[PDB]
Ligand binder design. Structure first.
Ligand SMILES: CCNC(=O)c1ccc(C(=O)NCCC2CCN(c3ncnc4cc(C(N)=O)sc34)CC2)s1
Ligand SMILES: [Zn+2]
Length: 274
């Protein structure tokens, strides 16, 4: 350091960074048409009427859900795969994976767009869960998300064929532990050679501490509206910030990498398929 974005693009082009750990949050999917839930006016938590919620947290609370699962299932029908499309940020991470450089992608999002973009499940830590599978709330039988799709789209509350309990998509609700796959962090963070943080400032724990868990010389590259959170509170000499609009930050890195044409082709193939 002091490193630039171009310096990092060169280390990626040289394949000196081949165990990239990526952490992403809400800021990467606003260009797909999903506002952060906290956005005034447009965000889930400011639209209690269209979900029929009595206060915003209730949508991810287990006792409310048991009392009335319909608000959560309205969200599930909106966020279920096929409604929103990944954007260039997600396709960039797909390209990182197709090139052999992605160790893990840790996502705070529940929109499932990393998996839609074609990154395999084994590369993802969906830290707040996923619509891609569901579990009986009573007997714990697992179901593929496709298996409750028809119910979700027809506004029926899916039921378990063994015990008749309600079947809930595998979103982690308030107060529940993170998914067991979260503890891959123990193995992945000491091993990362490049930490890439997109569309989140990682203020909330246990994510916040993870930013310090990479080794001393690992570059940490933040592509985010602003430099806040733990990278700001405790800067390291190989940190890079690319601020402002995350799509422009990522298009800029894609060009420095020489992947712009390869990105255009990938986005054409995929949005074809969708
Ligand atoms: C420490 C043990 N458990 C925990 O720390 C937690 C368990 C459950 C937690 C929780 O917040 N559950 C609700 C799901 C979250 C998903 C991400 N989230 C978001 N907030 C704001 N905007 C967005 C946008 C999202 C998207 N685009 O998918 S997710 C999300 C907050 C609710 S936090
Ligand atoms: Zn059951």
């Amino acid at each position: 350091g002091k490193l630039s974005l171009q310096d990092v693009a060169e280390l990626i082009r040289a394949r000196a960074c081949q165990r990239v750990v990526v952490m992403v949050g809400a800021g990467i999917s606003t260009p797909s048409g999903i506002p952060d839930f906290r956005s005034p006016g447009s965000g889930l938590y400011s639209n209690l009427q269209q979900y029929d919620l009595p206060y915003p947290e209730a949508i991810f609370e287990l006792p409310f859900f048991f009392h009335n699962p319909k608000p959560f299932f309205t969200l599930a029908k909106e966020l279920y795969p096929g409604n929103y499309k990944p954007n260039v940020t997600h396709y960039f991470l797909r390209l990182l994976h197709d090139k052999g450089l992605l160790l893990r992608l840790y996502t705070q999002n529940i929109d499932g767009l990393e998996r839609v973009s074609g990154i395999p499940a084994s590369k993802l830590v969906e830290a707040h869960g996923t619509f891609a599978s569901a579990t009986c709330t009573v007997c714990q039988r697992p179901f593929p998300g496709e298996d409750i799709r028809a119910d979700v789209m027809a506004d029926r509350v899916p039921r378990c064929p063994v015990c008749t309990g309600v079947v809930k998509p595998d979103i982690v609700f308030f107060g529940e532990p993170l998914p067991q796959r979260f503890l891959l962090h123990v193995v992945d963070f000491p091993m990362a050679d490049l930490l890439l943080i997109l569309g989140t400032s990682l203020e909330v724990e246990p994510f916040a501490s993870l930013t310090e868990a990479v080794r001393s010389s690992v570059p940490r590259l933040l592509i985010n509206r602003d430099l806040v959170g733990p990278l700001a509170w405790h800067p390291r000499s190989r940190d890079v910030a690319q601020l402002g609009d995350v799509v422009h930050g990522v298009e800029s890195l894609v060009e420095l990498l020489g992947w712009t044409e390869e990105m255009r082709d990938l986005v054409q193939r995929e949005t074809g398929k969708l």
